From a paper:
[name] is a soluble, highly conserved homolog of the nAChR extracellular domain (ECD) in mollusks such as the Californian sea hare ([name]) and can therefore be used as a surrogate for crystallography and binding studies. Cytisine, which is structurally related to nicotine, is a potent agonist at neuronal nAChRs but differs in displaying only partial agonist activity at α4β2 nAChRs, the high-affinity nicotine subtype. In this study, we sought to compare the binding parameters and structural interactions of cytisine and ligand 4 using acetylcholine-binding protein ([name]).
The monoclinic crystal has two pentameric assemblies in the asymmetric unit. A high degree of noncrystallographic symmetry is evident even though NCS restraints were released in the refinement calculations. Electron density for the ligand is well defined in all ten binding sites and they refined with average B factors less than or close to the values noted for their associated subunits. The Tyr110 OH group and the carbonyl backbone of Trp164 accept hydrogen bonds from the secondary amine of the ligand, indicating the presence of a protonated group. The alignment and distances of between 4.6 and 4.2 Å of the aromatic groups on Trp164 and Tyr212, respectively, from the nitrogen suggest that cation–π interactions contribute to binding. The ligand carbonyl group accepts a hydrogen bond, with a distance of 2.7 Å, donated from a water molecule that then bridges to Ile135 (via the carbonyl) and Ile123 (via the amide) on the complementary side of the binding site. The 3-hydroxylpropyl substituent interacts with Val125, Ile135, the Cys207–Cys208 disulfide, the side chain of Met133 and the main chain of Phe134. The hydroxyl residue on 4 is directed out of the binding site, forming hydrogen bonds to two well ordered water molecules, which in turn interact with other waters and glycerol. In the AcAChBP–4 complex we note that the 3-hydroxylpropyl substituent appears to force the Met133 side chain to adopt different rotamers and thus avoid steric clash. There is only a minor perturbation of the protein structure at the side chain of Met133, where a steric clash is likely to contribute to the reduced affinity of 4 compared with the parent compound.
Numbering used by the authors:
A (entry chain CCC): 20 to 224, 226
B (entry chain EEE), D (entry chain DDD), E (entry chain AAA): 20 to 224
C (entry chain BBB): 20 to 225, 227 to 232
């Protein structure tokens, strides 16, 4: 339909691509996790596999429009190929992340974007003692691979992972799941890098 | 042949692609499953593997033509890359879906589209008790990932999964298989999201 | 080289791609199999894995040329991406087919095409009794996914599968294999769909006689 | 640098791509193998897994230049996607080959090309007896899938496989490894087809 | 923002891509490793799996700009597809490397490029004795697949692998990890090829 075709043409065809954030124009990405399943533990390799979806939110002045000019359209669905998306990376993955959901984001007229990729992740986690009453704690950091806190900052709306869609017949019960903003430094670079640390305490369903 | 080449040029090389449904111009997708096989059960991970094909049907005013202007062509086969397709997603998959069929749809002159992809799906399912008389029940929801009920509604033509092509020598016998429209809500969003819940009761043959 | 570059530029750069067959302009695809190996049997899942090459042949008026206009060229090899190819699909695959050969077809001046992909297929097959003297029978149907018999018909040149290149040290001995045209109907659609049904009779290789 | 940019633009932006060899303009591909490892044996499926790199060499008049016109450049590295490469295929693979090296070739001013892809290959091989003093012999043929001997000929520079980079702590030791040109006919086609037969005799270390 | 969009347009849209190094304009790539985990050992195939990130650094005159003409911009992030990147390859891999990080480099106004890909590598390594106090030593060379020492030289900033991010609960403890420049010759070619030899001594925790 005609107004949406005109809006996407104006935002995407009639302009150069956003080159990502800079020290002079930084952005904040909001992250939140919905943990669906601890699928698998490998005690020979200390790898654990999670299925989750990761809510990402950011805002660009370059994606703003006036709904009055575009038939009162206030938001639209678009291919994530059409827009810049942040390079949010699991810092202790052992396999490439597997994508479980369509690469489609929602853009709102204030320039705000929400993108909610479902992923299967293999990460470094020692499951020794998962068969006990006290279980095991594992953690994985999610943040930009290449932008410091001077270009990409992160936040969470809450410290509590959403467990409302956790698989009730998983082999693993969740005892706690937190998502916490964290600062790290790396050998290569003096600047602080920001991540959200996902910390999960679990045990066999003891 | 010449009439079909003209039709495809007129439909695909003139307009921009359909930008998907909206609140002002919503779409109903019809979904149905043909279950071919329960291929694998993993009791160490509670993952079960299905092979099926999923019939999808929708209709766009933008895909209409007058057959009289195109040598009485009433439908054509086309690459699914040429057309918008709905983002129908399994909500509890544990692996990316494996595509088993050519990505080709049929478009009809009234603007109706049918697309029937074959898939192998791993999903969240506890098979504890599959070796018993009563067997086990597992369920997986299929719906738009990104469009609410205000842009994509769903329906089935029947609540009975088609079992007329179920593999006769499968390790697993199907006791029942249903496909039912449901409403769900998610933390992110106040709007209702529509799914078709595929519910399968099965046991070792 | 100059004459072939001219022919491919003329055939491929001047007109839209062939939009595939229609009820008005149907085509017949010839299929035949050369079975190279039964690689694997999965008795936990009733999956069996075949390696074969599949000879496909069809003919398009739009691929015709006069060899006298193109330095007496009578045929050429080309990327299978450059031409229409039939959507021949295994109906009981459990995994995406794996391609083992280059995607290159031969086009002949009469508009005939031959394309011989090598594939590894996992399909639905119960191997219970494969370790017996009699072995097991499995079958898989190959046909268009999307075109009825009104757009794509199939045939074989012979109902006998080519077993003369079967791997002599396979885990599995091939007893016989047939490739037979068949008509099917599906729930979605009233039109007949055509397949070639590949039937394989095999058993575990053990000096063991074949008697019936 | 300026002279190489000019050479690449002159070779690759001006003409249509080379349409491959013909009966009127045939080519010879030289092949040789460097065997790095027998990585795995599967006695349940009679599949063996090799890691090797394959030296391929051929010559096209269409890739010639005069070094004097391009700053005395006599050769250059280029993406294998920029040039025609031969469709050399293992005849008894059981899996798609896995590429282990960058897709980059070296073109020389006489029009000669050298391309040395590293591959992991699963092929048809019964390893029964590998744990014995005499070991086991397996073979795999490499050749064009689609070109006869009238369009592509093959040769070797030596019948000895290069074992100078064989992994010294492999599970398997090599007793012999040879590479031998052969000719045969196929049911589909009237002309002779060329292959190079890789024959490896090995045992447990 | 505007100054960065202008700089990228000037660097990438106005000239051909850099055609890689030559004997007349060679380059030096700095390499270093950050070892995150020895993930897996396969005693049946003598394959070991590493997770690491590899810091790569080089400098091109063609990537230089004056920050004064671009709003004081001194560096920028860019897709690795936008620029030339060196063909650094593990010489004893047994499977294609799996990429674990975004393909995004940083270009600085002096033309220097830093690119830090994270990878999972399967390579040739006999783990026999890893359960002992003395453990085992494995080695893998990293270098250009196609460029000799006349086009690509390598250096390290240190011969000590960075173990500051090694997984504290790995099955394997690192006893030592070194990264050392070395010269190799190959059968095909008389010229020296340069690699960085990654030597890791490890044992069961
Ligand atoms: O890849 C980059 C870049 C971009 C290239 C160098 O400027 C910056 C910083 C870092 N990396 C990779 C590692 C993970 N993230 C933090 C740190 C180490
Ligand atoms: O990805 C989206 C979008 C688009 C991005 C946000 O507006 C909407 C709604 C939802 N998701 C992802 C999850 C699954 N489906 C329902 C719900 C939660
Ligand atoms: O995908 C299609 C199409 C095209 C889409 C609907 O017109 C037709 C017919 C069928 N399919 C898929 C299944 C397998 N092949 C036969 C039958 C059922
Ligand atoms: O695919 C072709 C072609 C091209 C198509 C027919 O002209 C020629 C010859 C052959 N094949 C495939 C098989 C393997 N290689 C030799 C022989 C049989
Ligand atoms: O692929 C090439 C090239 C380019 C093609 C021949 O000029 C040069 C040299 C080598 N190779 C591959 C092997 C590994 N690296 C060193 C040596 C052997
Ligand atoms: C947009 O909003 C104004 C004010 O309510 C209304 O007059 C106009 O017709 C609307 N157009 C739409 C929804 O197409
Ligand atoms: C199309 O339909 C009309 C109406 O019956 C028919 O008479 C006409 O010949 C047809 N035209 C074609 C096939 O081009
Ligand atoms: C085509 O046909 C005849 C040989 O019968 C020959 O005289 C003519 O030169 C041929 N053309 C080419 C380019 O070979
Ligand atoms: C090419 O060759 C001669 C030396 O024989 C020399 O004069 C000339 O400068 C060389 N280099 C270039 C870049 O032309
Ligand atoms: C660039 O730097 C100079 C000197 O510090 C300053 O005066 C100028 O306004 C700066 N421009 C920017 C940040 O755009
Ligand atoms: Cl954007
Ligand atoms: Cl469309
Ligand atoms: Cl065609
Ligand atoms: Cl070429
Ligand atoms: Cl560059
Ligand atoms: K993007
Ligand atoms: K589509
Ligand atoms: K094709
Ligand atoms: K090529
Ligand atoms: K690159």
């Amino acid at each position: 339909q005609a107004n949406l075709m005109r809006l996407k043409s104006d935002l995407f065809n009639r302009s150069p691509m956003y080159p990502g954030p800079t020290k002079d124009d930084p952005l904040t990405v909001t992250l939140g996790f919905t943990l669906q399943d601890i699928v698998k533990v490998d005690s020979s390799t200390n790898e654990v596999d999670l299925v989750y979806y990761e809510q990402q939110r950011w805002k660009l002045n370059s994606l703003m429009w006036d709904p009055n000019e575009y038939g009162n359209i206030t938001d639209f669905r678009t291919s994530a190929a059409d827009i810049w998306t942040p390079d949010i990376t699991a810092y202790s993955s052992t396999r490439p992340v597997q994508v479980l959901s369509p690469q489609i984001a929602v853009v709102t007229h204030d320039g705000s974007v929400m993108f909610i990729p479902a992923q299967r992740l293999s990460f470094m986690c020692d499951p020794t003692g998962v068969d006990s009453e006290e279980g095991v704690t594992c953690a994985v950091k999610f943040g930009s691979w290449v932008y410091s806190g001077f270009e990409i900052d992160l936040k969470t709306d809450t410290d509590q992972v959403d467990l409302s869609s956790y698989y009730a017949s998983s082999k693993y019960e969740i005892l706690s799941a937190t998502q916490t903003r964290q600062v790290q430094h790396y050998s290569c670079c003096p600047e602080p890098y920001i991540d959200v640390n996902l910390v999960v305490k679990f045990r066999e369903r003891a």
